Symmetry: D2
Subunit: 287 residues, 4 copies
Amino acid sequence: MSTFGKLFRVTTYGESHCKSVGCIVDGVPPGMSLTEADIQPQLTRRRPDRVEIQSGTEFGKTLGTPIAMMIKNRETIGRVASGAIAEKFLAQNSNVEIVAFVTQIGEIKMNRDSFDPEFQHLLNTITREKVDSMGPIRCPDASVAGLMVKEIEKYRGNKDSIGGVVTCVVRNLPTGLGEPCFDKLEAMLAHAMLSIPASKGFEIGSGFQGVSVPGSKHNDPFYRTKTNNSGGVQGGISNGENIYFSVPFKSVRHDPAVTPRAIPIVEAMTALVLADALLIQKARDFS
Amino acid sequence: MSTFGKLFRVTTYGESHCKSVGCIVDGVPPGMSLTEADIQPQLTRRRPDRVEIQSGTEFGKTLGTPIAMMIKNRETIGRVASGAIAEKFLAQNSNVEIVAFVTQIGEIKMNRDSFDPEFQHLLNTITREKVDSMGPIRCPDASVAGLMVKEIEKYRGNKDSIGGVVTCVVRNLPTGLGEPCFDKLEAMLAHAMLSIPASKGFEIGSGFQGVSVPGSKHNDPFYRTKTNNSGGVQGGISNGENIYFSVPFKSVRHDPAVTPRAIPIVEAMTALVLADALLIQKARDFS
Amino acid sequence: MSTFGKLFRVTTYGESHCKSVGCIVDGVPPGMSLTEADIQPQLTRRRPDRVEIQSGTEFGKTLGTPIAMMIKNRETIGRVASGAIAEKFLAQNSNVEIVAFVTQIGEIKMNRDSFDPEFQHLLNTITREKVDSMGPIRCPDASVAGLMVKEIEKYRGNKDSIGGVVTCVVRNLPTGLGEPCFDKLEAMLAHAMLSIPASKGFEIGSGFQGVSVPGSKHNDPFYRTKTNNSGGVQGGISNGENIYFSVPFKSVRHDPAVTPRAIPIVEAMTALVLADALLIQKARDFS
Amino acid sequence: MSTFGKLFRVTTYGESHCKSVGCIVDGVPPGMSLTEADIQPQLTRRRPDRVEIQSGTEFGKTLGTPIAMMIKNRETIGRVASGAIAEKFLAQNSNVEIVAFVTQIGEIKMNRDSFDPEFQHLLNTITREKVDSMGPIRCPDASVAGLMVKEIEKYRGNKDSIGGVVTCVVRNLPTGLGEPCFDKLEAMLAHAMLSIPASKGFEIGSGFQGVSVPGSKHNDPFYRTKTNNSGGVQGGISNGENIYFSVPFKSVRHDPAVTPRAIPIVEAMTALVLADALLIQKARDFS
């Protein structure tokens, strides 16, 4: 249905032609600074439309009760709005960084080979500000960014559309997140990503491409130190390495800016998943 | 944790070195024929080890209470065991057919282009019996099956391992299955598949490869009638077309038969997902 | 947290001093007539304050998507609002009748002995309209109603308050509702009732008072046909007899109209529980 | 269904005439000492029948994986077994004490008035060992215990049965447990207690009897310091005062030792609820 999460929960609402769209976020801890200004930046980024908090805060801080947010005039705004709260909760209680970006438009692919030190260096350093500095295409590889824009213009000229891939990295994630055997972190992430409109998949770490590479190269300490081929999970829980994953989107009514526009949704869904996982993990760290 | 499902539920248990492994299946309807013989075939297929029902049946039929199954001496047997029940429930109350098979070992790829009429014809006709007739490699494409076996033998010679992709088709699925906006059928499937040990991904329909193909070709009525490019879902619910999806597996302790051995787990997880979805859909078909 | 239900779900929001209060109702079937006028009657009854539907309907009918409702300026309105939807869903798909009423204020008790044919006759015939015809006290027993009003006035004179008991009957409930062993119908009802502010308990059927009566009298076919002593449940599922139960409320800031004002909340919570149970039961009636 | 709990979870199985009965307990923290000897005492107490741990431990300690327990030859053993784990988890991580006892058999009532200093003193001091020292009747009030035994013998002579009330106290509970607005601690407890076979109710603190007492006496600081009239909850969360509640049981096949035999089930259900609540509360204490 339209509730997501176990302890950090969002319930959404809203169709195209209705009075409002929004969500209710439940399980946010009391005492955290939160106003509309913490939420608008990511909502503005949905174009490479306002938001008022109805409840759950007082004098700029959260009460620990349900936080309803509404925007006047299905729709993914509630996801992005709720993810902005998750993101702040994670920034404070961890310095987690979540950055998504375009790695494919149509036939044009950024190299994102998990064994490639340059790709790894990009995962280590990329930031939202850098992603946005590229223009609306939001691909931080200048050897292909302009070819992607041209692909988009080829299809726009033909009154056609084409899909792409969004890749996301998460840094500074604590160890132990995820809940085997069925709610392993990668499974919670996949569930999240496949729910996004026009998503057709999910892969983590070495993914589909690493099927071509022998196990020895995935695991050996040198290949020149070993890369992050797991995408930050072992046995279904975070190992403190970077999480990275990719999601393909379909274009089709035509787009064809589906892919760059999907960055904040991917980021939001990631934050919701990681905020839930962090709460669940603190439940049993105590115990 | 180790419970999967909402209305058709399985809770599993078991490590490598413990007294037994098993599961409890909850939400099976009363009155269905079920004995150990309905469960053994798929468990035997885990090699290209017994099982006794502890509860939930009487005189060969289900009571509607929890069905505990145990096998003396984490482990995925409980998944396969519970999936055999799901599969029978779906066969009776639908004629659903679920068939998984190998489409990649290492560098060797079966063509599985969603726009290719031959691939579509294979999705329409493939059966378990045909999959198993190929040998342990379980790839029903003789142009590549023997090259896959040779890839496996190359890596076995090197005391190495290598991964692969399992592709799964579901036929005769009723319309309306899946629960938007967050428990869309493809999201329930992805969650299921990413929980399988050594899984690194999930894609449905046109997937990652269809990112290279314009929207016009995905959607036009002719390309020669339109193929199943969605993989059987629209707006997150089944449309009565074939469901098909693929999952990549890592090899690494080395294998390298991880991929063909994963077929029954993929089938089992698929059946659990579809049995749950079918129950949830009947809840509101009534209403 | 602030979500209630499994398949018929409500998530609520709202504190005393916030911009609005409301809820999101998820799992309502498509095609049912619903506008604000179906919701106002029960909300008006919270005094022995408006409501606008934000989403989930079109041209007076439900879409099957989340129905957000909001009232400008914790709070129990969202419960009552969502329960009005549940109630309509149950009236249509069953002719279920839910009627709550006051049976105790302070020291003044209406006789509600399960073995008493008059009490049983009242359970069989009582209606909301009859309950409200009594005045704000909402106790349909004139031998005690006026003594209850006088009790209230005694305590109001003393700038004090006092509690009471609300009793609720449900008629025409289909058989098979409830989900043993842990979500038995009486357990779902108890969970619901103990969540209401100022509730201190829950009892069904013969309850606390029937502890004094031997088993033979509970079960014998004559005592003059056997009464409904179970309160409509056997083995945790509805048996098609009347459901009846009682809830005590505390008075304390003072009231002392807590008890009569709680009638619509009790009715609403009952409807939410029974609408969920009915959906879950149809899930496996099919199967 | 037959799963109970959110983070501390038990799934049970077993009918009268099946191969075994048992449960799977999920969410127990790793590193805790646990063997069969921690579980047998409470199971023996089910008579005023063995148990083997199948999984989840190694070298006498918990692994953090699912703990399956089985007893060869519905049934409530799995509840009691799982509750023994919950109880140990709570004893270690809190010094919580849970003590249940008989307060009514048939017409014979122990005084349990919340305003009565003697009742309060008993809640403060009662222990299991003291409860069991009374004989199988398990009522620690000698002014009525022998009258209760005689009531039981009156009905046993008549080949009849009669019910009773079990009262339970919890001491040293940390503050903040429970999850408003719908999973308030008293609602989680009520849900738990109404699921026990033959349970017909639940009341906490002043309960049904305190409906007769004005609000001033419930709340005033002196009445001689104020008693615990809330039963240890305010706004649906624990306030660090003693929790106490009572549950009525029906006798009917006849018993009539249903009531004293129900003590360990009540204790077990209490422990499961409080272990879950404690985990959920630690989730957001962190945050």
